[PDB]
Structure formats: C-alpha cells, structure tokens
C-alpha cells in the first residue's frame, strides 16, 4: 500500500487505490456528461414547468 | 344401464383397485423388511 | 355473535398455528 496516502492506508490496498482512482475519474466524467445532458434536455423540453 | 361405461371402469376402478392392492402389498413388504433381523445397535448397550 | 364468535374461532385457527411456532423456537433456542 505504498501508493496510498497514509490517511487512507487503513482502508485502501495498493491495487484498490488505482481501481478507486479509475472509479472516481469515471464518476466525475459521467457527472459532467450527465450535467450536459440535463442542460440539453432542459433547453429542449423543461420537465418542471 | 345400471353399469358405468367401460371408460369409467378402466380409469377409476382398476386404478382404484391397483392403488389399494398395491399399497397393501407395498406395506406388507415394507414391514417384512423392517421387522426382519439385520444389523441393529443392541438397545441394552447403546441406549 | 357474528364478529365475537368469528374472532374467537379465528383465534383458534391461529392457536393451531402456535404449536409449530413453538417447534421452530425450540429448535432455535436449543441450537445455541
């Protein structure tokens, strides 16, 4: 677990930290895409009305 | 005219007869085997 | 009489349940 910050060493393995980084970046990219999709769908047809 | 149909008989009554008879014979042989003498743990000892 | 007697008989049906429930609780308590 040398790659893990010592704050998260009790929780994250060395390999689990890299997979967690991938998951975090994927969640962030998906969030940006979801925000863009929501803005586009609102400009198209507002659902709240 | 008092007689059920051949179909009725075959279906109901010879399966009825078979079930009753066969059950009785299967019980006879079930208990012949169960009351025969075979390896048991002697009750005076094991219990 | 309709609802009083009906509910007493209902409770007898559930009482009939009861012995099996005692069996399950017996298994649980005696397998510790």
């Amino acid at each position: 677990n040398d790659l893990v910050p010592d704050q998260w060493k009790p929780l994250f393995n060395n390999a689990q930290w890299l997979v967690h980084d991938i998951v975090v970046k994927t969640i962030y990219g998906g969030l940006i895409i979801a925000v863009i999709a929501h803005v586009l769908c609102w400009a198209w047809t507002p659902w709240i009305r | 005219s008092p007689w059920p149909v051949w179909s009725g008989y075959a279906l109901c009554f010879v399966p009825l007869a078979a079930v009753i008879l066969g059950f009785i014979i299967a019980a006879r042989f079930t208990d012949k085997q169960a009351t025969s003498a075979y390896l048991r743990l002697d009750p005076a000892k094991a219990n | 009489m309709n609802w009083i007697v009906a509910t007493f008989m209902l409770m007898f049906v559930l009482v009939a349940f009861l012995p099996l429930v005692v069996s399950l609780a017996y298994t649980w308590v005696t397998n510790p």
Binding site: - | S1, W3, V5, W6, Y9, A10, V14 | -
Partner: protein
C-alpha cells in the same frame, strides 16, 4: 435362472384375473349380449 418361478406365477395369475375382470366388465357394460337384464 432369469426369473423366479414364484414371481412369474404371481404376475401371470394377477394379470389373468385383472384381464378377466376387465373383459367381463367391458362386455357387461356394452349391453351387446342381453346378460343380466339386457
């Protein structure tokens, strides 16, 4: 000894009795003969 003789006897006798009863009942129910009140 492929078959016990007692087994073949039991099976044949039971089959014959069952078939005699079945054929009697089929013939009596057919009403084709006038036996026991038509």
């Amino acid at each position: 000894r492929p078959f016990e003789f007692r087994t073949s006897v039991v099976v044949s006798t039971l089959l014959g009795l069952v078939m005699a009863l079945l054929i009697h009942f089929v013939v009596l129910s057919s009403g084709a003969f006038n036996w026991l009140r038509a």
